[PDB]
């Protein structure tokens, strides 16, 4: 059961990591596309992870 917790915490980590990895690419992609519907660079950096 000692290693049980190790793998348990491992799964979640990568699971979120991968999501965050895509999130990083998606966040940039959002701003990338943000030009035909709001390119305001100083008015697009409002909430960070919200």
């Amino acid at each position: 059961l000692e290693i049980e917790e190790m793998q348990l915490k491992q799964a979640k980590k990568d699971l979120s990591e991968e999501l965050q990895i895509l999130e990083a690419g998606l966040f940039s992609r959002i701003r990338a596309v943000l030009v035909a519907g709001g390119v305001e660079a100083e008015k697009l950096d409002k909430l960070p992870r919200d």
């Binding site: 409002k46 909430l47 960070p48 992870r49 919200d50």
Partner: protein
């Protein structure tokens, strides 16, 4: 579990003045010293023990306990008790129809949660100063009211109460629902709505604390089991 001597030390045996009594508490009363009613500790203790046992049992089946005490003297203490055993509580004014009208109050809870999220996880800031202030105020209001019960999800499977006469609305609601009630009931109070009556001094702080602590312990034990 809780001894008689300890109770005595605390001031459980003391009650209210004789003119403010309820005659339904005549069984649990022993006598009247200096025109103030004395609760019978011989009859109290076993009952208390039984109540504790019941609580433990409830805990064991993963029961949700709600700790109610809006006296304002023992508001700090009840919250603490709740948190020790990671259970829910209502330390400020009981909202009329908290349990009976859960479905409306569940919306309120949700709103509160949302507000909290906005405050903390968002990290957006940049809000109009008056509006922001208003939001903050709202959050404060919600926290005060429904802070303990925000993670309760549904209705509790038992209801621990520090004063029956003061929290009669809560008790009534419980009765309506069919939730077991575990009330501390001084001589002035009415024991008829209460399932597991505990004859004891609601008013004195030390006594209240004592009452809380044992209950908390029992809950913890149940959880462990």
């Amino acid at each position: 579990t809780v001894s008689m001597r300890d109770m005595l030390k605390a001031g459980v045996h003391f009650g209210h003045q004789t003119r403010y009594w309820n005659p339904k508490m005549k069984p649990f009363i022993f006598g009247a010293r200096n025109k103030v009613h004395i609760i019978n500790l011989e009859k109290t203790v076993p009952m208390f023990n039984e109540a504790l046992a019941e609580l433990n049992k409830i805990a064991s089946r993963k029961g949700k306990i709600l700790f109610v005490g809006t006296k304002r003297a023992a508001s700090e203490a009840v919250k603490d008790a709740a948190l020790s055993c990671d259970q829910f509580f209502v330390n400020h004014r009981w909202l009329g129809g908290m349990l009976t009208n859960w479905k409306t109050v569940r919306q309120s809870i949700k709103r509160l949660k949302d507000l909290e999220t906005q405050s903390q996880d968002g990290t957006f800031d940049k809000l109009t100063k008056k509006e922001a202030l208003m939001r903050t105020r709202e959050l404060e209001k919600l926290e005060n009211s429904l802070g303990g019960i925000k993670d309760m999800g549904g209705l509790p499977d038992a209801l621990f109460v520090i004063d029956a006469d003061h929290e009669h609305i809560a008790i009534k609601e419980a009765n309506n629902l069919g939730i077991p009630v575990f009330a501390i009931v001084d001589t002035n109070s009415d024991p008829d709505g209460v399932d597991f009556v505990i004859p004891g001094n609601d008013d004195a702080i030390r006594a209240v604390t004592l009452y809380l602590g044992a209950v908390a312990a029992t809950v913890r034990e149940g959880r462990s089991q």
